[PDB]
A paper describes a structure:
Class X myosin has been found to be localized at the tips of filopodia, which are plasma membrane protrusions containing bundled actin that are necessary for cellular processes such as cell adhesion, migration, angiogenesis and the formation of cell–cell contacts. Myosin X is required for filopodia formation and extension. Myosin motors move along actin filaments via a series of conformational changes in the motor domain that are coupled with the sequential release of MgATP hydrolysis products, Pi and MgADP. These conformational changes in the motor domain are amplified by the myosin lever arm, which is comprized of the C-terminal subdomain of the motor domain (known as the converter) and an extended alpha helix length that varies with the myosin class12.
Given the surprising large step size that we measured for the myosin X dimers, we next evaluated whether the motor domain was capable of generating a larger angular swing than myosin V. We had previously shown that myosin VI has an unusual rearrangement of its converter domain in its pre-powerstoke state (PPS). This state in fact corresponds to the structure populated by myosin upon its re-attachment to the filament with a primed (pre-stroke) position for its lever arm. The PPS structure differs in the orientation and position of the converter as compared with other plus-end myosins. Comparison of these PPS structures show that while the subdomains of the motor are totally conserved in position among the myosin PPS structures obtained to date, the myosin X converter is rotated compared with that of myosin Vc and other myosins. This is not due to a conformational change within the converter as found in myosin VI27. Instead, a sharper turn at the end of the SH1 helix, (at Gly672), allows formation of specific interactions between the converter and the Nter subdomain in particular with class-specific loops of this subdomain.
Author numbering: 3 to 598, 607 to 741
Write the structure that this text describes.
């Protein structure tokens, strides 16, 4: 096991194989330097085989498809991504699955229109791996397959899911324009322009700075593009999931509120700024509590200009844009209302109340009364009761959240109205969720986000491993099952009867229950569950062993957040608005007054995720796995421990194994024969269809290792299908 200076070796250390070089070998000491800059020293006598092994020559600053790898260990997989990342190749295939490592910098030529053009005219595998090749293959599947397609993008907060989604949309929008024979109706619709302009609007209203991402998505998005038989986008539909409405009124230290507030304050002209009584973001409680009002990566004034342009494309009138500006200004002033205790909560600093009442079209005495008192009618006289200061603050904040959430819903409705079109043929759906996040302090918001990420990982495992191997078994293929990391029991802990969501919902329906009584119930029921953590010291927390790591959640605020109560006194007040825009938002809204069962945030979200997964189940999926190379948002900094952790927990190692050994493409015998009949013209074919399929497959892969015949289908590897598709097009 002796290797001379400069020899390339795999060094087994710290539970992995390190790509390394022999630095020195003298006086019975051997020093290895890893490609990651770690230096490991040993007594030469202690080095044996398997501990140190020679590395396979070159093979050669990486491989494009990791199913091509001979060494399948985590060290080999990560080294391939590292070699490629160092030369700005952030994309690697695993069959048709795409790995994307966030470069945290622009890369010359990578997303230029000349590159988009090049990918549109090639087959998957002909060019270097790229998100444009996946978008193109997905698009080609609308004529190669019989179903709708979907692209699902996974990753922690900051991994690159939102950037990936926008790149796919830009590529499809460009390709939609290449389509023939483009009618004047379809050329003048500007529907692709509107679809692309939906992103700056939704990011301004739904994204915010967090520790993991200066542009974190605080809602989930599913974008459906309806494509005609001729290949042109006819229109689309956007579905939003669980906006983080509590961000409007409170943020963690160092975070910001939604981008749009800072854009509005930096972007409005002096006249409109004075009309809405607006000053700097520091002047507003809803924007100043976190201690951060700016970020060097964001020009808030430039974002405002971008939002204005996008809203014009989206057919928001100039008056509608002003109404949205006025509502946001009203919310900012509302947040500055302070209360003192005399009775009874009383408004202290009356200026903010007067400004907010004017901007919201409310009478100031009516707004003061609604925030400081509760009303009830008893056959048939009104009985006014004082609220305390915490109840007045909760009322002020619920008003701010309701205004923002209804305004966001209206914005999404307007986008959907603009991009609405025919659905005559097929669709491509793209899922952009909020990513996995584990902060210093996690609340109900992180619980819901991490649950959605857990659900998406279960969806990835179901398609890549579970349904895939079940199909091989049902078809009678020669196959040895590949084990995978199954997160099913974590979802069972969250979703089953007596599970986390069930207990949270049950406690929410009890008026006397508190976050403290909820925690006692969570601990009592689940202390022995392997996926649940009862903290030894942190008295306000519970933990969940998520697929992406253990997360501790502070229970404080869970019941109030889950109930999501809105006082009928405030709903009645909003309906008094003289500002038609505000009245229109609350005109037909259902009552959510405290009860003395109504859907909760958890019950509606569980239903929305189950409905989403059902939509995705009917489509053919493409998977993109975004990987963060480091936790410092740095370019050219591949932190191997951070990368390896994501590769391992996400099941990338087993994914390479199943894509390498398995057969991801399948067609019934007659379907295969009818599709590729042109490629069989020089073959002496037998009478039976199974024999006809075998003759073509043996011609294109004589090793007989890239395909198998099942009971009803031909099964083949993606590399063989790409080889057959390229030749079919040529003929
Ligand atoms: N492909 C990319 N090229 C360059 N920078 C990128 C790329 N993907 C992401 N980034 C950088 O990382 C940041 C976070 O990416 P984003 O897509 O918002 O993450 P996620 O949606 O997964 O939370 C971006 O705002 C940008 O600075
Ligand atoms: F912060 Be990312 F949108 F997950
Ligand atoms: Mg995002």
């Amino acid at each position: 096991n002796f290797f001379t200076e400069g020899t390339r070796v795999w060094l087994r250390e710290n539970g992995q194989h390190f790509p390394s070089t022999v630095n020195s070998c003298a006086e019975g000491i051997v020093v290895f330097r890893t490609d990651y800059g770690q230096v490991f020293t040993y007594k030469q006598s202690t080095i044996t085989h398997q501990k140190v092994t020679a590395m396979h020559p070159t093979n050669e600053e990486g491989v494009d498809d990791m199913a091509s790898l001979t060494e399948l260990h985590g060290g080999s997989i990560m080294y391939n991504l590292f070699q490629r990342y160092k030369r700005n190749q952030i994309y690697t295939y695993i069959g048709s699955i795409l790995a994307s490592v966030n470069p945290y910098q622009p890369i010359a030529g990578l997303y230029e229109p000349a590159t988009m053009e090049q990918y549109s005219r090639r087959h998957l595998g002909e060019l270097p791996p790229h998100i444009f090749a996946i978008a193109n293959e997905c698009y080609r599947c609308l004529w190669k397959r019989h179903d709708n397609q979907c692209i699902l993008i996974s990753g922690e907060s900051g991994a690159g899911k939102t950037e990936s989604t926008k790149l796919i949309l830009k590529f499809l929008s460009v390709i939609s324009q290449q389509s023939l024979e483009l009618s004047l109706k379809e050329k003048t619709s500007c529907v692709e322009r509107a679809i692309l302009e939906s992103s700056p609007i939704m990011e301004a209203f739904g994204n915010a700075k967090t520790v993991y991402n200066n542009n974190s998505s605080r809602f989930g998005k599913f974008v459906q593009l309806n494509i005609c038989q001729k290949g042109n986008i006819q229109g689309g539909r956007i579905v939003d999931y669980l906006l983080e409405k509590n961000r409007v009124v409170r943020q963690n230290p160092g975070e910001r509120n939604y981008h749009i507030f800072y854009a509005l304050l930096a972007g409005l002209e002096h006249e409109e700024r004075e009309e809405f009584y607006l000053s700097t973001p520091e002047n507003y409680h809803y924007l100043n509590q976190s201690g951060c009002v700016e970020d060097k990566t964001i020009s808030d004034q430039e974002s405002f200009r971008e939002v204005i342009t996008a809203m014009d494309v989206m057919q928001f009138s100039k008056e509608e844009v002003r109404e949205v500006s006025r509502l946001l200004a009203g919310i900012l002033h509302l947040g500055n209302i302070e209360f003192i205790t005399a009775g009874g909560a009383q408004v202290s600093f009356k200026t903010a109340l007067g400004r907010s009442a004017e901007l919201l079209g409310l009478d100031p005495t009516q707004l003061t009364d609604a925030l400081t008192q509760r009303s009830m009618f008893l056959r048939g006289e009104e009985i006014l009761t004082p609220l305390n200061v915490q109840q007045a603050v909760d009322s002020r904040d619920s008003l701010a959240m309701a205004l923002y959430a209804c305004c966001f819903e209206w914005v999404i409705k307007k986008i959907n109205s603009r991009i609405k079109g025919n659905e005559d043929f097929k669709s491509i759906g793209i899922l952009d969720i909020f990513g996995f996040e584990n902060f210093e302090v996690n609340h109900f918001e992180q619980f819901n986000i991490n649950y959605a990420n857990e659900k998406l990982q279960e969806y990835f495992n179901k398609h890549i491993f579970s349904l895939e191997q079940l199909e091989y078994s049902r078809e009678g293929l020669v196959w040895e099952d590949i084990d995978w990391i199954d997160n099913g029991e974590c979802l069972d802990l969250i979703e089953k009867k007596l599970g986390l969501l069930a207990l949270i919902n049950e406690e929410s329906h009890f008026p006397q229950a508190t976050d403290s009584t909820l925690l006692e119930k969570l601990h009592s029921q689940h202390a022995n569950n392997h996926f649940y953590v009862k903290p030894r010291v942190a008295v306000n927390n519970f933990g969940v062993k998520h697929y992406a790591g253990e997360v501790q959640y502070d229970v404080r605020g869970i019941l109030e957040k889950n109930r999501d109560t809105f006082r009928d006194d405030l709903l009645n007040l909003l309906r008094e608005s003289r500002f038609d825009f505000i009245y229109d938002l609350f005109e037909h809204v259902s009552s959510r007054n405290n009860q003395d069962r109504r859907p909760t945030v958890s019950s509606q979200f569980k239903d929305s995720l189950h409905s989403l997964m059902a939509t995705l189940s009917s489509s053919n999926p493409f998977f993109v796995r975004c990987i963060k190379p480091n936790m410092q948002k740095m370019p050219d900094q591949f932190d191997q421990a951070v990368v390896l952790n994501q590769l391992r927990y996400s099941g990338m190692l087993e994914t390479v194994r199943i894509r390498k050994a398995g057969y991801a493409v399948r067609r019934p015998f007659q379907d295969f024969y009818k599709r590729y009949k042109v490629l069989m013209r020089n073959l002496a074919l037998p009478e039976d269809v199974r024999g006809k399929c075998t003759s073509l497959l043996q011609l294109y892969d004589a090793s007989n290792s890239e395909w198998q015949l099942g009971k009803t289908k031909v099964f083949l590897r993606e590399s063989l299908e790409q080889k057959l598709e390229k030749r079919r097009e040529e003929e």
